[PDB]
């Protein structure tokens, strides 16, 4: 029943939001296949008679000719601005193709939207990129990015919601209006954004919901007279959203949303979420500018993540070189010579326990668990086959790890690729962390049709059995130590065979 | 030595500024004038000699001096907004920085043509430009759209993407030229065009503009600051006189205006977005900053797609690497012998036409292989460096005895296991005859007379021999992965042999 949250066909809602008009048409002659029901009020045209008719009937001859010229022999990926005044109401036109048919969306521009101009709100664009490149911290990047986005959009709340591996996400940047609830640092259940929503947003990197009280406007005819199926509004900005999400936004107290998908290597790294207490529409030009800001944000995040990884590598290079020098001139087994100086090995990874296993002898330094427990863990670790392994919560993946979770809640293990059972394990003790959640972690939904949770208060969750995160430099140091041990061990076996 | 004189001039201390602006180096607290450019005798009509030890209120007015004082007070001078002033009826754009405990303020003179140009329309397609940059799937597309946008905003006839090489010389990879204008696409340029001093300066200052090449430098009076009795360091000053040799070089090219943005990748001068105009024309500082931001985005996207290409090569070589690893694991012989069991797969792993496998006084050659003695001499030379892997596209350049077999093996990709036993795998690529294009005389960078830039700018063919096809990033990745697999398998075999 929880999994029902990821079963709705969001790609085929059969309706569009009332803030615009939709026209799915045949490509060559621009004959109308289906039209949204909103044309009974806007432009005053009956949607039933608008079947198998050219765009000239409703949109006028000149605008239809312009659309025909634009869509002819074009990939529809570099279409310029298209603003039309159709019976005195202004529309911004976007073109794409769903299934061998031309889908055209007319976003209705109100007087407030017309007053807003793309020049002044994007005048500080170059200064914003200069600040982005000049920022030396990720927090500075987030702060200036959400500040600029709030400046152009004008929304009360702007969030940077980064997703985790399991699905749930965390807010890391917050820019809120006065007397407005703060979600900085709060974790949210994965049910807020289902797998279907994430999959859709991996392709469409821009979504806007001006109002949460809107009544969806159905598409007539519902079935296309081409394949007798439902129109795929996957890349359509004029797509009705699930009513559960509207109720969720109402429960949060916001009535307008605007999200830009952040993509890093084809994965939904995070979302630039936005929130307004009152309905308000954002022009498509500003939305595209925010999308470009999001792509630049992802690029700079990747750049500084690589910078941090290289900084950790540089600060661990000296320790790695010292350990390599000790290993090369020990004349004993590689891990024995490594264990000759235990404190240096400890500070190489910053762990409080060292366990070195070499063919039925295990040596423990510092805060070390029971040797039998470490042996059982080690024989479990070789089953995966990975040369190195890092785990910040051993009890989560290793059920018998709860007994010694107070002593060893973080395990960083690395072993040489030889039949002899050998390896090096670093243990980090548990740190008691009160993770902050927005609402009930154990009650994501008010089971009644699914209903979003009404309560949005901060809950403390004392998450036990989790140690300090292993940094990228930590696993880099483990891998470099493994490589040095490989080289030195090969040298020793070759020399021993020679002599 | 005399050629090295190209990298000895003190460009950071020219002692003069270009006439298209005004310079004011001042004391920080009271904004008292330390030195002022000599151009104030014509602009604003002030004697530069009497303007010593005087506040900015004397020349710049009370309100503008107060604004500058407020801006420079308790500020890092890295986020200063626009500063436009109308000083005795002529407009200036003000830039602030600090050289040595003193406030350096540059007033770029904005002409009527510059005033007519607005930052809105020329940057209206900014978001579309970034969308095109991110949507481009090829480096050539990136270069094309980048130079197209930069030419659109700047209006210059020629725009070049000049990427530097390791040795200093660079190559143009993007070209956007006006009709009836000479093309430099694909041409190589000698390293003497941009000396080491210029590269070092541009590594810090990522924006340079020279509106005119016939300008007479305007000296700074007093020449020596009455603080340390030294010369003012105009390293980060846009109003800095350039070397006359560079002006003569630009005149020889036929251009009278230049505009370059430094491209930085990991703290290194990857390349320059060079520009060229046949007539003098000034570009406002706002458009120059926008072009600088475009250059930084260009570098970021270049790095992104370079990583993408490296990962694509890794992916397309993963299957071959896995097959070779499977063959290595179940051979029961020596690692390189089992590797040599299938020579064609090893060849197509790196796309080389010669394979040489060395294992303890036996060398096995497959395909186009040199003389075994030559390969042995090369191999004993290779272990001297100590690098686990080595890639060379021109062996004769670094290995003098490699000219004998340059027709057969001009590219060497070698990888060896870290053991006392002399073992290794070498891949040989044959020489490909390439006619490198140079702009002018490669053997005569300068017309030795003071150094004089070369007058001739015609295309010269240079048949560069002894150079094989470049080893790709995927090539060295495959070599390193093969080395790692050989390391793991060899350790397993020695451990098993010791056990039994
Ligand atoms: C089990 C079903 C539920 C549900 C489904 C659902 N939700 C969306 C859309 C979104 N939900 C979002 C979540 C947040 N908005 C915020 O402001 C914050 C944090 C402060 C969170 C975690 C977001 C960002 C979206 C995207 C839309 C937007 O607001 O821009 C969908 C997708 C609907 C569609 O695209 O048509 C679905 C199916 N959400 C729940 O919470 C439960 C009740
Ligand atoms: C041995 C001395 C010489 C000399 C010195 C020199 N040159 C510069 C400045 C530049 N030279 C550049 C070269 C090019 N411009 C182009 O258009 C092309 C290709 C089509 C090339 C290779 C460039 C780009 C610069 C930077 C300035 C600019 O044009 O934007 C300096 C630096 C002077 C200063 O910064 O004050 C110096 C010392 N150049 C020679 O060719 C010889 C004669």
PDB file of N, CA and C in Angstrom, chain B residues 319-331 338 341 485 489:
ATOM      1  N   UNK B 319      35.457  -4.112 -22.099  1.00  0.00           N
ATOM      2  CA  UNK B 319      35.216  -5.485 -22.539  1.00  0.00           C
ATOM      3  C   UNK B 319      36.520  -6.185 -22.903  1.00  0.00           C
ATOM      4  N   UNK B 320      37.393  -5.499 -23.646  1.00  0.00           N
ATOM      5  CA  UNK B 320      38.688  -6.078 -23.988  1.00  0.00           C
ATOM      6  C   UNK B 320      39.533  -6.319 -22.745  1.00  0.00           C
ATOM      7  N   UNK B 321      39.514  -5.379 -21.795  1.00  0.00           N
ATOM      8  CA  UNK B 321      40.273  -5.563 -20.563  1.00  0.00           C
ATOM      9  C   UNK B 321      39.770  -6.769 -19.781  1.00  0.00           C
ATOM     10  N   UNK B 322      38.448  -6.944 -19.712  1.00  0.00           N
ATOM     11  CA  UNK B 322      37.880  -8.091 -19.011  1.00  0.00           C
ATOM     12  C   UNK B 322      38.246  -9.398 -19.701  1.00  0.00           C
ATOM     13  N   UNK B 323      38.205  -9.421 -21.036  1.00  0.00           N
ATOM     14  CA  UNK B 323      38.588 -10.632 -21.757  1.00  0.00           C
ATOM     15  C   UNK B 323      40.053 -10.978 -21.516  1.00  0.00           C
ATOM     16  N   UNK B 324      40.932  -9.973 -21.549  1.00  0.00           N
ATOM     17  CA  UNK B 324      42.345 -10.225 -21.288  1.00  0.00           C
ATOM     18  C   UNK B 324      42.573 -10.679 -19.851  1.00  0.00           C
ATOM     19  N   UNK B 325      41.831 -10.112 -18.896  1.00  0.00           N
ATOM     20  CA  UNK B 325      41.939 -10.550 -17.509  1.00  0.00           C
ATOM     21  C   UNK B 325      41.502 -12.003 -17.357  1.00  0.00           C
ATOM     22  N   UNK B 326      40.408 -12.380 -18.025  1.00  0.00           N
ATOM     23  CA  UNK B 326      39.949 -13.765 -17.974  1.00  0.00           C
ATOM     24  C   UNK B 326      40.971 -14.712 -18.585  1.00  0.00           C
ATOM     25  N   UNK B 327      41.588 -14.316 -19.702  1.00  0.00           N
ATOM     26  CA  UNK B 327      42.642 -15.139 -20.289  1.00  0.00           C
ATOM     27  C   UNK B 327      43.847 -15.244 -19.360  1.00  0.00           C
ATOM     28  N   UNK B 328      44.190 -14.150 -18.678  1.00  0.00           N
ATOM     29  CA  UNK B 328      45.338 -14.138 -17.780  1.00  0.00           C
ATOM     30  C   UNK B 328      45.112 -15.018 -16.557  1.00  0.00           C
ATOM     31  N   UNK B 329      43.892 -15.018 -16.016  1.00  0.00           N
ATOM     32  CA  UNK B 329      43.631 -15.734 -14.771  1.00  0.00           C
ATOM     33  C   UNK B 329      43.711 -17.245 -14.954  1.00  0.00           C
ATOM     34  N   UNK B 330      43.341 -17.747 -16.132  1.00  0.00           N
ATOM     35  CA  UNK B 330      43.250 -19.181 -16.382  1.00  0.00           C
ATOM     36  C   UNK B 330      44.265 -19.657 -17.417  1.00  0.00           C
ATOM     37  N   UNK B 331      45.508 -19.187 -17.324  1.00  0.00           N
ATOM     38  CA  UNK B 331      46.546 -19.590 -18.263  1.00  0.00           C
ATOM     39  C   UNK B 331      47.508 -20.583 -17.621  1.00  0.00           C
ATOM     40  N   UNK B 338      50.658 -15.811 -21.019  1.00  0.00           N
ATOM     41  CA  UNK B 338      49.233 -15.956 -21.252  1.00  0.00           C
ATOM     42  C   UNK B 338      48.628 -14.751 -21.943  1.00  0.00           C
ATOM     43  N   UNK B 341      49.332 -15.182 -25.536  1.00  0.00           N
ATOM     44  CA  UNK B 341      48.615 -16.273 -26.188  1.00  0.00           C
ATOM     45  C   UNK B 341      47.669 -15.767 -27.272  1.00  0.00           C
ATOM     46  N   UNK B 485      45.803  -5.518 -13.416  1.00  0.00           N
ATOM     47  CA  UNK B 485      45.372  -6.909 -13.511  1.00  0.00           C
ATOM     48  C   UNK B 485      46.563  -7.856 -13.468  1.00  0.00           C
ATOM     49  N   UNK B 489      47.073 -10.744 -10.622  1.00  0.00           N
ATOM     50  CA  UNK B 489      47.249 -12.132 -11.030  1.00  0.00           C
ATOM     51  C   UNK B 489      48.631 -12.655 -10.669  1.00  0.00           C
TER      52      UNK B 489
END
